[PDB]
């Protein structure tokens, strides 16, 4: 571990600076180092971890799609395939890294709903990103489904329907259904039920909580508009 000699608190501080500098590869390396100190992560620290790797993998996904589109046109020299493979392998490495942190040992030490659902959602997300490039394709999809389903089950028992973690989980699981599992009707049903049950719970919330919940509800609506 490159970060083994740096203090946990210093790693977190530098993750926050890296975010301000839009240096997301650094941010992710700092948060990986923080995780590897072996202590549980706070709410803020979990979100630093997620934001860092989301930005890293996002650049890789966007690049992979550009290259895959070029490759597909060229099949209507080996360089396009070779370089698409290069980016794909780097993407799979980042996903494997995140899954490794969740398995060693973030999930097994997460007992509170807000932490356990957060990590299981991430596990579904990074299996989903592996699924987007897979051509074990079925087992990867079922690993995503399993993680999302366990997170859903916990969130329905332990969190109110406006909880932003629960809402973001349902959003992402809906997209999994639509795009990965080829289950558009399941995706639409989940998005609609999630939106309506949050709507009916907004009356319980403060102004600040209302803003957090309605932000994600709008993403559910955006998708439903394209899907129906």
């Amino acid at each position: 571990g490159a970060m083994g000699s740096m203090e946990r608190a210093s790693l977190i501080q530098k993750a926050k600076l890296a975010e301000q500098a839009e240096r997301y590869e650094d941010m992710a390396a700092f948060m990986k180092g923080a995780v590897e100190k072996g202590e549980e992560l706070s709410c803020e620290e979990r979100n630093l971890l997620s934001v860092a790797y989301k930005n890293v993998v996002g650049g890789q996904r966007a690049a992979w799609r550009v290259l895959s589109s070029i490759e597909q046109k060229s099949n209507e020299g080996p360089e396009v395939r070779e370089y698409r493979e290069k980016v794909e392998t780097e993407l799979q490495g980042v996903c494997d890294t995140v899954l490794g942190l969740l398995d060693s040992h973030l999930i097994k030490e997460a007992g509170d709903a807000e932490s356990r659902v957060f990590y299981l959602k991430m596990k579904g997300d990074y299996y989903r990103y592996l699924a987007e490039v897979a051509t074990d394709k079925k087992r990867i999809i079922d690993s995503a489904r399993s993680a999302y389903q366990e997170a859903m089950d916990i969130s329905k028992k332990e969190m109110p329907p406006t909880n932003p973690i629960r809402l973001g989980l349902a959003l992402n699981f809906s997209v999994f259904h639509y795009e990965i599992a080829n289950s558009p009707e399941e995706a639409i049903s989940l998005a609609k039920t999630t939106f309506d049950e949050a709507m009916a719970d907004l009356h319980t919330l403060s102004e600040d909580s209302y803003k957090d919940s309605t932000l994600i509800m709008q993403l559910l609506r955006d998708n439903l508009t394209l899907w129906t």
């Binding site: 934001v51 989301k54 930005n55 890293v56 973001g168 959003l171 992402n172 993403l219 955006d222 394209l226």
Partner: peptide, 12 residues
């Protein structure tokens, strides 16, 4: 590809 909305930074 048309990318649907998912949670968090739309970094792709």
């Amino acid at each position: 590809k048309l990318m649907f909305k998912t949670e968090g930074p739309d970094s792709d």
